[PDB]
Amino acid sequence: VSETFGYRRLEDFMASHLDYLVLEWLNLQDTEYNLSSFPFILLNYTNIEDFYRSCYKVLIPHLVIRSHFDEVKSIANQIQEDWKSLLTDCFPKILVNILPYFAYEGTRDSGMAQQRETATKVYDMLKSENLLGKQIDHLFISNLPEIVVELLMTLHEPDLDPAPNPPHFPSHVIKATFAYISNCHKTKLKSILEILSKSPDSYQKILLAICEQAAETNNVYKKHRILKIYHLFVSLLLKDIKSGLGGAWA
């Protein structure tokens, strides 16, 4: 099936849907179906250690959003790496499962609610001194661009169009998350692009990131989704052109 679809190797094809696979496996909530019980033989991984070292960027965010810290500490202790580094590498992937729930009309739906306070609790225990909460503000303000890239990657508008990876939100939720991020800043800038203008080169990175996605996929539907994300980002850039993007307009 992988060579039929045009993927160079089965690993890329399986890692495309690994997010959905892991989420459904965890939601199935069977005691016998633990993280180690997940079949990694389909991923050409001979042992679980290589599977962890290859897909940690996906595994840790899902455990963190379900408040499973002893599992991630384990994966750290048999991964031959510090758990702080593993937590700080996948910070935007954890964030995209937390920030959008805060800014979108809470208490309207029961499921969206329980999601929004469960993300609230996750953020609160993340702020603890033992975890990375001591320097979470510096990390948030340091590397913004791929946070924006990851959040924009979740765009999906609900017509026989296959859905993306399970974490996906509409455009207005994304704009509300941008506004919430802007207001959360100490200076409280009106828009996120104002604090993005403090580093004029950052915009370029974001653009390149989107283009990189268009490079890695040959599927028409995925290409159309990336085009929609690019259109949304370019429109957002064009909206506030008068202020100037820190001299990076040309």
């Binding site: 390149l208 990076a248 040309a250």
Partner: protein, 133 residues
């Protein structure tokens, strides 16, 4: 190619030589000034390119197979020759050592940059060793 170009532009503009170049080039009315403005940054300390010190630099280039290609691997031959020239500590120019990532993605860039590498190495040559080789 675009990512490598952005990285090279940032690294070059982060050095003292880039600042000196900009100080004169800012007078000119050129679209390149507007295009390269975002990548220009103000920092207290200029970027310090590491000084590579080999025990012997000549044996890296002293190879007959390295110079004469096989008539079907021109791209590989020129890339290997440029990479061998850059790897050794012969060069002293600040901006040249920052051009390695871009040389690995384009053959035309290697062809363009090789004469400058040779000129820089020969300029600082002592007791006619690099010249003879």
């Amino acid at each position: 190619v675009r990512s490598a170009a952005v990285t090279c532009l940032k690294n070059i503009l982060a050095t003292k030589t880039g600042h000196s170049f900009w100080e004169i080039y800012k007078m000119t009315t050129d679209p390149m000034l507007a295009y390269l403005q975002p990548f220009r940054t103000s920092r207290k300390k200029f970027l310090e390119v590491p000084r590579f010190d080999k025990e012997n630099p000549f044996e890296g280039l002293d190879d007959i197979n390295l110079w004469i290609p096989l008539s079907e691997n021109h791209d590989i031959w020129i890339k290997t020759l440029t990479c061998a020239f850059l790897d050794s500590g012969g060069t002293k120019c600040e901006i040249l050592q920052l051009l390695k990532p871009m040389c690995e993605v384009k053959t035309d860039f290697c062809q363009t940059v090789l004469p400058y590498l040779i000129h820089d190495i020969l300029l600082q040559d002592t007791n006619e060793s690099w010249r003879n080789l």
